[PDB]
Structure formats: C-alpha cells, structure tokens
Design a protein around this ligand. Structure first.
Ligand SMILES: O[C@@H]1[C@@H](O)[C@H](O[C@@H]2CO[C@@H](O[C@@H]3CO[C@@H](O)[C@H](O)[C@H]3O)[C@H](O)[C@H]2O)OC[C@H]1O
Length: 189
C-alpha cells in the first residue's frame, strides 16, 4: 500500500489520489499490476500507466473489477492547455458517468460501440489546482474488465466532434470510486 501521489513502480507510472476521507487501499504489484480495495471510501482515483500519455497508445488491461456502488474502470488521463480530464470507460458500478450528459457521437472500437459525451467540472480539484474544466467521455456499451483500448480511435473521434485535447499529461488505467466499496486487481500493458 502506498500513500496518494505519483511515481514509478516496476517500470510503470502510477497516480493515486483521494480526497483524504479514508477507506481505500491502493497497492502497486509486480509489473503493470495494481490493486485497489476500498470500503466506505470517499473520492479516489488510482491506476498504472504512463506519464505522459500518447495520442495513439494501445492500452491493454486484464483482471477483476468488483465495485459495490459508484465506481468506474477507465482509461483515464489529462491534457493541459486546454485542461481536460478524459475517460474511456470500460466498466462501472451503480452509476453511468454520462447520465444526463449531452451525447456528442458514437465511436466503434475494440469490439463495442462507445457513446461520446462532454461534461464540465466547476471549481473542482485538477492536476493544476482547483479549476473549471471539461471532461471527455467514451462510455463502452458492452462492459468488460479485460481488453485492449486503441486510444487513437477515441481521441480522433473526440477531435472530430470538437472535443480537442491539449498536451498530454498522465494516462493510466484507473479504478475510480466515490463513496462506495469494492475490490479490483488490474494488470496494464
Ligand atoms: O498534489 C496535487 C494532487 O492532489 C493533484 O491530483 C489530481 C487532482 O484531481 C484528480 O482528479 C479529480 C477527482 O476525480 C475526478 O474525476 C474529478 O473531476 C477530478 O476532479 C487527479 O486524479 C489527480 O491526479 O495533481 C496535481 C498535484 O499538485
């Protein structure tokens, strides 16, 4: 188990963040592996990947994802200038993050159709401090906890629809939770 923060572990960049609430354990394992076990958590996001991401990375992931409540499993990362939090959501718990959001298209990639959305966070934490910024979403219709994500297909379709990214910051497979419980064990490559 590690403190929230960022660094490298067995060759992979990791980011682990929470809102301080308690109830989440993040573990870096061998190779590209990480595990998250949480019980009546606050908000948190943790996973392994790269710093910086690229616009055409093929990300592979495999393992087990057992949320009990509000949680996502996503390729997750940020761009700078413009500041964007983005999500290629492969699975989730009790909440589809695109509920109520404006649908801005579809993309077919890696065995499923994804629905595309933009949302906005207002004065929320970010990689550069409290800010108001857009989120880009690709929400997979066929949920899964293993597979391959051709991020180019998503970034290109986003750009097509006017969801353009700035300079890439980190890019990970992440388990996210908001006041929920669960376990996950995920291996990235
Ligand atoms: O030490 C600083 C960190 O705390 C900062 O980390 C980022 C803070 O925001 C994270 O994203 C938020 C929560 O879950 C998301 O879905 C919300 O919209 C986000 O508001 C991101 O995970 C962290 O990396 O990074 C900069 C540091 O100075």
């Amino acid at each position: 188990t590690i403190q929230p923060g960022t660094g490298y572990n067995n060759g992979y960049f990791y980011s682990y963040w929470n809102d301080g609430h308690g109830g989440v354990t993040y573990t870096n394992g061998p190779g590209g592996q990480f595990s998250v076990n949480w019980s009546n958590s606050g908000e948190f996001v943790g996973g392994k990947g790269w710093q910086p991401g690229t616009k055409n990375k093929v990300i592979n992931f495999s393992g087990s994802y057992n949320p009990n409540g509000n949680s996502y499993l996503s390729v997750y990362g940020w761009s700078r200038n413009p500041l964007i939090e983005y999500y290629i959501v492969e699975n989730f718990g009790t909440y589809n993050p695109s509920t109520g959001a404006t649908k801005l298209g579809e993309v077919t990639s890696d065995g499923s159709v994804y629905d595309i959305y933009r949302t906005q966070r207002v004065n929320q934490p970010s990689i550069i401090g409290t800010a108001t910024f857009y989120q880009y979403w690709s929400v997979r219709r066929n949920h899964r906890s293993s597979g391959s994500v051709n991020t180019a297909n998503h970034f290109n379709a986003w750009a097509q629809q006017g969801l353009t990214l700035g300079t890439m910051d980190y890019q990970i497979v992440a388990v996210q939770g908001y006041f929920s419980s669960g376990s996950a064990s995920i291996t990235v490559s």
